[PDB]
């Protein structure tokens, strides 16, 4: 960083302070700590060792069946052509996060209130998806899968 | 003498008298790159400069310049070129320059592209948008392979010239040389020494005359003998086993 | 590694890519080879004055030679245009390098008379190696 | 092995188990371990014993507390899932 | 680059300070001098002539030298398994011949925070000029004297600053024949060819293993002070060791001591220098399995 | 590309709550990927002055070893700009991780004036970290592509209407001979063309001094003998 | 008083004379080049107004590409 | 020290080798075949089109292999010249085997296995070339077919190239006949697809090339069709833009 | 026994050592081959590196069949293997057809010959494109190969330093049309044209196709030719 001294030789002084504060001495007791990250590499296994922190708690993407909750709560508060199937939705993409189902589930609105249309065609739905998800791997360069 | 006197053409007239250069009209050259095996004596050639014009050296051993910072050894050549603008007739000697003139290769490292970045501080400032005025820049490596052929343009260095092993006037001249301060008698065969050396340089006279010494300190010659400098012969020619590649001829 | 200083992309992109429009009229920079940049330098619309600059060639070679042999004292009657008719290849600043081994060669000899073997003995100090020709394939 | 069942000891006396069960085979179950792992091992039954209403800790409870930390929790949990030896 | 007293007011150079004592340099001197007669050094006693004709005649007669008129030596190299013994000369030298001892270890010219070579070395061999004008022990130069490359992302382009600083400091400016260099390399190796020329160290003094009886003599030196029972044979030791070092003539001692401490014996017993002859199996494992 | 513009910008900044009365929130920025800025810096600038005060440009990546986190650590300081200039518009071109972190520490679902309009644009290969690189963290993502011989045509009616002109052009074959600019190969045609006027004494400029000034831009291909594939 | 500069970049233009003339009257074999940088630095510093009846644009940065001498 | 990878997986679940053969395919000309029941015909691009060659041989991407079947071809050309002299020497040995001609499908598979065994074993670079598949019998009647690198085969109605044909069967989809084998609809829409996802202008003739191969009385013909139809063709197809931007 | 390849792909899908051997090809040298409307005209400027070689013992020009010559782009030791390997070749076609063997089956076989030594890897692909020329049947060929085991076909076609500037100065010079003696004229005119200054009867060296078949010309005629041929 650059509002920084020697780099390799701060934050490991700082980090250190944190090894011995957060799970050394000063008796526990009762005081809840809990932390987050998304990747695990950089960890040093220092903290990771156990006494300091016990669970390791990954996150999967959801399946289908909690996909419909998110889905429908997501267009619980919109005006929808109900004809319509978000099961295509809830099957098609494989490895949506929440955000693709909010980006999806408001993107369709943005394609029906695009034109004014209080609801929502499944075409709406295609672009919707496909205008949220891009760069679809599937054939052109390799797509060797087929 | 051939190199004492065109090195000295290239080197002395000049500051002597730069006017015949005027009354030619054509700018006088820079620099030169002495080459051949190590420690034959450019460092000591150097250090007869050193002896001739007795004015301006700034010689530097030319490795010590990157500590661990980027523009740090930039910043120590600016400096050093610039303490030679400030000083009209002054005189650079640069010895292994291998160590940072270095050759660019594809980027895939990490610490002699500052020896790249280093080295273009040597393509520009070698020239400038000035050039030097009266500052002459000596050169010596050992190879002169390695380094890069865009400083191998003449103008900034006029010419390569080679320093060969030592021929055996050179062996011997220099060799009484190193026989002056020598308690001696009318003993010595200096052919027993120089035919039986092969090509020694003046230190390694100084290897010959002093270790013949010291084998006229065993059994306490206060005087010194002949025998003495063959034995010295023995060891130092035994000694050469460790000792290959030669030679490194440039461009 | 010193991927901050790899800040000096993002540096001339954020600095020159994006214009100035008023105010500094040419920066101008220049070495042979180009593996550097161009989506950022030669560009639809940044190409105002951005023009690429080749090599020059034959009729000014013998303008370099006039040019330059009048700094010396050319003797009397010793030309000098029977040499570039020839491949030669002696890129610009190089005859100033045959004008000086040349000049001060016949300095060697400390006389201004300048003559024919101070053209073919700057032949003899300069490009002459490499390999003169291969000549097949 | 047996210092591993010295532990087992350690935190098996320390916390509301059941006395019917043994640990050499949890010492097998456990190749290259700290004893600080032994007691997470023996607070995750107490999980399980949380789960469930148990206080004397079954055999079960343990054995699901290492497939537990040892093999559903090494990487993610699923170190096996392959025969091809047994 | 001086400490002096300077006004508050006036802002006058008042008084020079006799504080400057220079940390680790002052510290670096060895004032105790611990004895090592030459009566420890067992196998070596050629080093020890050649070592006196080198190093200890150089501070007592140069004219023995400069009446026949050459030269002093410039450096010699200790080198050898790192048991053979570098500390005895260093020890011996220190209190057999009457000098001011001042050593110097390998990664001594090494911090993190960088700027020059040139001050540690420039003042503690120009702190020494004075005050240690006769013997420095340098020691590990192995350690720091290391080959050089050219190569990117790697290697180390400064510590031969220190040394070529130390060459240079030392000799060719003001050349005074008022020091004695003393490197003992683990090895040779690594080391610069500009580190060992002629002048920088002349000798290249190898030190060989302890083949029987500096083995034997050497952990007779341990066991000197020890209560040893009679019933010891060193030939049967030192001769059923293998490849021992006088480090490990040491260990093996010192863990016929421990192993012999062991039980409560009231002396050291020859099964337990036995015991030591095997300590633990140097590497121990002892697998049977494939041997059978 | 205007449209989604108009999406991403204009119906939060003229009907938000028209927006907001179907109850769903609103996205921030389109990430203009392309050659390096193909109708960006006149783009963004030119149409985004006429919001009158709801455009404040910090740039946002020119020093970006000091102009980010060194000073403003928590580079939120701009976040305070944004929040106390609520008409505001911001974009962007180890640290860059952190910043990127506190971006997503406001930026998610933490939000005073309501999604401001933080852009980033880059280049060629989107391999930053991609810990920015989920949608609900940059909602709109626009690809810039070579425009059209309709879109280079209608460029090449833009920058060539200012020029001194010859009657008797035909600007279809121009655009026609063109591979594809980002942007304003046009403008460039159109310099080298009056230039060629220039050099010369002309003041009617023909097609031929474009057709020449487009053999100036465009160019290089060679090296047969390597006919594999 | 306020002081709208500060002192330098690094080494800020040589400002008097250092500048090491042969160019324009003097130069052996760039035609191309010293006819285009003449083209495109010269006549826009004095006729900015044929930079206007043809309406052309403002010079802008250049390149050269060639071998170490 | 010195085994590149050669014969291996991904530390994960892919292959190596095959992903950087297709690589290689999509920088190459563009070849296509069409929906014919009478015959059926092929597309080919002319790479090198420089002016001073000769192009006295009348082929360069087909290879009428035996005597009612040809092959287009992308990729290494001189690996695939060995593939065509084995390939003839397969289906000609089956007809020494026979004294008939091959079923048109078990070829495909053998030349499969003939790379196939490359992609596991031999320590050695495959064949990164992708090709096509025409001919006729008496169980199909002409038939289309597409090789792998993978050492699988797609039995198509409409190929597909590389990068210069991923909107080409794009088009194809869009694009799609069916019933009509009429071979100029596959004239005039193959004049399209080149039209369009060649970057040639205007399609110039000397830039592509088309060959058919049609049912004719027990023979079953090939068609290496010279250059003037095609010229026709062009004048044709610009006159189909031109009934294109009538609608203007 | 090793061998399984040395050739991997670039991850750009490219081939290294082949572009390194097209590098070491293409920084040699610049020849000239020319088809006329009769014959074909191929020439080199065989310059020695001393003044004491001599040209009668080592000749580039080298004919396969009596009316089939040839030269090659790179060095004479692999030139001299692969020549021996395509006159066997030449003569398996006259043993099983006794028949003079068109050229373009000297390229189809050649090239892939070559094609497998670019294959296979504990040896090195040979640096060598070839310019093949006979007249066959009526017409005279000019087929140029490369080391990559493809192949070509020109209607003059040269290679090496300056090739396209010399190739441009075909393009320009030459055309369609020509004899045999103005395809020397043009080619001593492309010859020197990057040549060295000094080119007598023994630098250059000229092998011509007639329809009556393959004639390697002498410095003789040579001197009696290019003694300023314009
Ligand atoms: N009902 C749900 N079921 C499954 N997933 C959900 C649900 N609601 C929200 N999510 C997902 O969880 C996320 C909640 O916000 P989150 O804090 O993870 O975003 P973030 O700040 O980018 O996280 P991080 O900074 O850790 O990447 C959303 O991105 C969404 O995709
Ligand atoms: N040509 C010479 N004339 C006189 N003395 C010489 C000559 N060459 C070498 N010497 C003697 O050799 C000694 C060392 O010379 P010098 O320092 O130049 O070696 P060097 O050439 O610098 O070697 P290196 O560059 O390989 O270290 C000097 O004391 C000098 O007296
Ligand atoms: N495809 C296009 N569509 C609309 N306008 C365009 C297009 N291409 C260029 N322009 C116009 O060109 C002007 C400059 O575009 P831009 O700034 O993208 O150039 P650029 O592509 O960034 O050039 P460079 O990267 O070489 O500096 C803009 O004002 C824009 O209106």
Not at chain 9, 41 to 49: D, M, S
Request: proline share 4%; net charge neutral.
């Amino acid at each position: 960083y650059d509002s920084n001294s020697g780099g390799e030789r701060e934050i490991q002084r700082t980090m250190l302070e944190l090894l011995n504060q957060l799970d050394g001495f000063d008796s526990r007791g009762d005081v809840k700590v809990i932390m987050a990250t998304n990747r695990i590499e950089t960890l040093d296994p220092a903290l990771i060792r156990p006494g300091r922190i016990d669970r390791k708690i990954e996150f999967p993407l959801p399946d289908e069946k909690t996909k419909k909750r998110i889905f429908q709560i997501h267009t619980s508060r919109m005006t929808l052509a109900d004809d319509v199937t978000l099961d295509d939705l809830i099957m098609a993409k494989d490895d949506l996060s929440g955000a693709d189902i909010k980006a999806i589930c408001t993107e369709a609105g943005l394609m029906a209130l695009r034109e004014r249309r209080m609801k929502v065609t499944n075409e709406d739905f295609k672009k919707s998806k496909e205008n949220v998800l891009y760069k679809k791997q599937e054939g052109t360069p390799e797509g060797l899968y087929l | 003498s051939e190199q004492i006197r065109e090195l000295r053409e290239v080197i002395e007239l000049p500051l002597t008298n730069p006017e015949l250069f005027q009354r030619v009209g054509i700018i006088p050259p820079k620099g030169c790159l002495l080459y051949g095996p190590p420690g034959t004596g450019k460092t000591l050639l150097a250090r007869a400069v050193a002896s001739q014009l007795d004015c301006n050296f700034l010689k530097v051993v030319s490795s010590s310049i990157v500590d661990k910072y980027i523009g740090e050894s930039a910043r120590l050549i600016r400096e050093m070129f610039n303490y030679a603008r400030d000083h009209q007739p002054c005189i650079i000697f640069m010895d292994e320059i291998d160590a940072i003139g270095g050759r660019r290769f594809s980027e895939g490292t990490s610490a002699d592209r500052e020896i790249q970045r280093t080295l273009m501080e040597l393509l520009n400032q070698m020239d400038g948008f000035d050039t030097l005025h009266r500052v002459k820049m000596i050169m010596a490596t050992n190879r002169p392979d390695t380094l890069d052929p865009a400083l191998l343009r003449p103008g900034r260095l006029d010419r390569k010239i080679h320093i060969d092993l030592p021929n055996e006037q050179a062996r011997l001249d220099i060799l009484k040389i190193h026989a002056g301060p020598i308690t001696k008698h009318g003993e010595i065969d200096y052919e027993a020494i120089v035919k039986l050396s092969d090509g020694f340089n003046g230190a390694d006279l100084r290897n010959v005359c002093t270790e013949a010494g010291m084998f006229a300190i065993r059994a306490d010659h206060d005087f010194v003998v002949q025998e003495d400098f063959m034995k010295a012969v023995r060891k130092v020619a035994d000694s050469k086993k460790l000792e290959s590649k030669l030679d490194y001829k440039p461009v | 590694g010193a991927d901050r200083e790899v800040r000096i992309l993002l540096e001339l992109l954020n600095q020159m890519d994006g214009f100035d429009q008023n105010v500094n009229v040419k920066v101008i920079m220049a070495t042979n080879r180009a593996d550097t940049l161009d989506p950022a330098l030669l560009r639809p619309g940044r190409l105002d004055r951005k023009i690429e600059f080749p090599l020059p060639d034959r009729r000014q070679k013998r303008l370099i030679f006039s040019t330059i042999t009048s700094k010396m004292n050319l003797s009397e009657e010793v030309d000098l245009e029977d040499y570039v008719a020839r491949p030669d290849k002696i890129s610009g600043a190089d005859i100033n390098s045959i004008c000086q081994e040349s000049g001060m060669l016949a300095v060697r000899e400390n006389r201004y008379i300048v003559l024919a073997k101070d053209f073919e003995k700057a032949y003899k100090t300069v490009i002459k190696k490499d390999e003169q020709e291969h000549e097949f394939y | 092995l047996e210092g591993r069942t010295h532990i087992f000891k350690i935190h098996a006396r320390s916390m509301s188990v059941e006395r019917d069960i043994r640990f050499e085979l949890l010492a097998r179950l456990c190749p290259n371990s700290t004893g600080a792992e032994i007691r997470s091992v023996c607070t995750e039954a107490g999980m399980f014993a949380i789960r469930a209403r148990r206080k004397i800790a079954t055999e079960k409870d343990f054995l699901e507390a290492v497939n537990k930390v040892i093999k559903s929790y090494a990487k993610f949990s699923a170190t096996p899932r392959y025969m091809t030896y047994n | 680059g001086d400490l002096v007293g300077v006004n508050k007011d006036s802002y006058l150079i008042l008084e020079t300070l006799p504080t400057e004592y220079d940390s680790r340099v002052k510290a670096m001197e060895v004032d105790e001098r611990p004895t090592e007669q030459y009566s420890d050094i067992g196998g070596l006693d050629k080093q020890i002539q050649e070592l006196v004709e080198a190093i200890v005649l150089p501070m007592n007669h140069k004219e023995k030298f400069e009446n026949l008129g050459i030269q002093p030596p410039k450096g010699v190299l200790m080198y050898g398994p790192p048991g053979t013994g570098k500390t005895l000369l260093a020890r011996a030298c220190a209190a057999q011949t009457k000098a001011t001892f001042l050593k110097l270890a390998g990664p001594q010219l090494v911090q993190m925070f960088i700027g020059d070579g040139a001050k540690l070395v420039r003042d503690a061999f120009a702190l020494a000029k004075e005050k240690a004008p006769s013997i420095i022990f340098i020691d590990e130069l192995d350690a720091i004297g290391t080959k050089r490359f050219d190569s990117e992302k790697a290697g180390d382009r400064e510590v031969q600053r220190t040394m070529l600083e130390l060459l240079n400091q030392l000799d060719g400016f003001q050349p005074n024949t008022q020091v004695k260099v003393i490197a003992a390399t683990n090895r040779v190796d690594i080391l610069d060819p500009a580190l060992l020329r002629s002048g920088r160290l002349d000798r290249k003094i190898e030190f060989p293993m302890p083949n029987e009886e500096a083995r034997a003599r050497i952990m007779q030196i341990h066991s000197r002070k020890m209560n040893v029972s009679p019933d010891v044979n060193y030939e049967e030791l030192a001769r059923c060791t293998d490849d021992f070092n006088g480090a490990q003539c040491k260990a093996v001692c010192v863990e016929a001591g421990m192993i012999a401490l062991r039980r409560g014996a009231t002396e050291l017993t020859h099964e337990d220098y036995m015991e030591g002859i095997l300590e633990v199996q140097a590497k121990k494992k002892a697998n049977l399995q494939y041997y059978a | 590309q205007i449209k989604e513009i108009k999406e991403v910008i204009e119906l939060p900044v003229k009907h938000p709550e028209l927006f907001e009365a179907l109850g769903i929130a609103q996205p921030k920025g389109v990430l203009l990927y392309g050659p390096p800025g193909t109708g960006k810096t006149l783009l963004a600038r030119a149409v985004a002055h006429h919001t009158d005060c709801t455009f404040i440009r910090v740039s946002g990546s020119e020093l970006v070893q000091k102009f980010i986190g060194e000073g403003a650590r928590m580079v939120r300081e701009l976040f305070v700009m944004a929040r106390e200039h609520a008409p505001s518009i911001i974009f962007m071109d180890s640290e860059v991780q952190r910043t990127m972190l506190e971006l997503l520490n406001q930026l998610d679902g933490f939000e005073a004036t309501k999604n401001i309009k933080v852009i980033m644009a880059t280049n060629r290969i989107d391999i930053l970290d991609s810990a920015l690189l989920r949608p609900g963290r940059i909602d709109r993502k626009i690809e810039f592509p070579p425009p059209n011989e309709e879109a280079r045509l209608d460029i090449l009616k833009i920058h060539s209407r200012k020029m001194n002109l010859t009657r008797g052009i035909n600007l279809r074959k121009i655009a026609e001979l063109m591979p594809g600019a980002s942007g304003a190969e046009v403008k460039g045609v159109c310099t080298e063309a009056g230039m060629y006027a220039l050099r010369e004494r002309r003041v009617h400029v023909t097609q031929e001094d474009f057709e020449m000034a487009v053999a100036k831009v465009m160019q290089k291909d060679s090296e047969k003998n390597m006919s594999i594939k | 008083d306020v002081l709208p500069p500060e002192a330098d970049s690094s080494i800020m233009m040589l400002t008097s004379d250092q500048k090491p003339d042969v160019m324009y009257a003097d130069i052996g074999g760039m035609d191309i080049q010293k006819q285009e940088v003449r083209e495109a630095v010269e006549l826009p510093l004095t006729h900015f107004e044929l930079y206007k009846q043809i309406g052309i644009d403002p010079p802008r940065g250049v390149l050269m590409y060639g071998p170490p001498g | 020290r010195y085994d590149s990878r050669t014969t291996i997986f991904s530390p994960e679940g892919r292959l190596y080798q095959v992903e950087y053969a297709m690589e290689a395919i999509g920088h190459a000309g563009t070849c296509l075949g069409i929906l014919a029941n009478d015959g059926v015909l092929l597309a080919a691009e002319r790479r090198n089109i420089h002016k001073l060659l000769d192009e006295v041989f009348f082929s360069e991407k087909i290879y009428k292999l035996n005597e009612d079947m040809a092959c287009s071809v992308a990729g290494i050309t001189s690996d695939a010249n060995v593939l065509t002299n084995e390939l003839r020497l397969i289906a000609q040995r089956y007809l020494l085997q026979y004294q008939e001609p091959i079923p048109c499908e078990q070829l495909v598979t053998a030349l499969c296995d003939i790379k196939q065994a490359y992609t596991q074993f031999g320590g050695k670079r495959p064949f990164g070339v992708s090709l096509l598949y025409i001919g006729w019998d008496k169980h199909y009647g002409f038939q289309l077919y597409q090789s792998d690198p993978s050492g699988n085969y797609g039995g198509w109605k409409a190929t597909c190239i590389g990068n210069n044909s991923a909107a080409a069967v794009s088009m194809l989809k869009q694009d799609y006949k069916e019933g009509e084998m009429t071979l100029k609809s596959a004239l005039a829409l193959a004049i399209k697809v080149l039209n369009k996802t060649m970057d040639v202008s205007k399609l110039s003739a000397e830039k592509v090339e088309i060959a058919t191969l049609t049912r004719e009385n027990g023979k079953t013909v090939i068609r290496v069709l010279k250059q003037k139809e095609v010229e026709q063709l062009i004048k044709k197809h610009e006159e189909e833009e031109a009934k294109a931007e009538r609608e203007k | 026994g090793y061998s399984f390849s040395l050739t991997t792909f670039s991850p750009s899908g490219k081939l290294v050592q082949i572009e390194y051997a097209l590098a070491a090809v293409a920084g040699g040298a610049p020849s000239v081959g020319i088809k006329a409307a009769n014959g074909v005209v191929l020439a080199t400027e065989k310059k020695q590196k001393s003044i004491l070689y001599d040209e009668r013992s080592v000749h580039k020009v080298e004919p396969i069949t009596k009316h089939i010559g040839l030269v090659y782009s790179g060095m004479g030791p692999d030139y001299r293997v692969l020549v021996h390997r395509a006159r066997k070749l030449a003569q398996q076609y006259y043993l099983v057809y006794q028949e003079p063997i068109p050229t373009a089956q000297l390229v189809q076989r050649v090239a892939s010959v070559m094609q497998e030594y670019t294959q296979s890897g504990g040896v090195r692909p040979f640096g060598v494109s070839l310019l093949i020329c006979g007249w066959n049947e009526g017409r005279p060929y000019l087929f140029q190969s490369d080391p990559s085991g493809a192949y070509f076909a020109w209607k003059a076609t040269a290679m090496g330093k300056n090739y396209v500037n010399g190739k441009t100065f075909l393009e320009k010079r030459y055309n369609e049309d020509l004899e045999l003696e103005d395809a020397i004229h043009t080619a001593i005119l492309t010859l020197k044209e990057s040549f060295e200054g000094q080119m007598t009867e023994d630098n250059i060296e000229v092998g011509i196709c007639n329809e009556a078949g393959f004639r390697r010309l002498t410095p003789t005629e040579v001197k009696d030719y290019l003694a300023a041929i314009a």
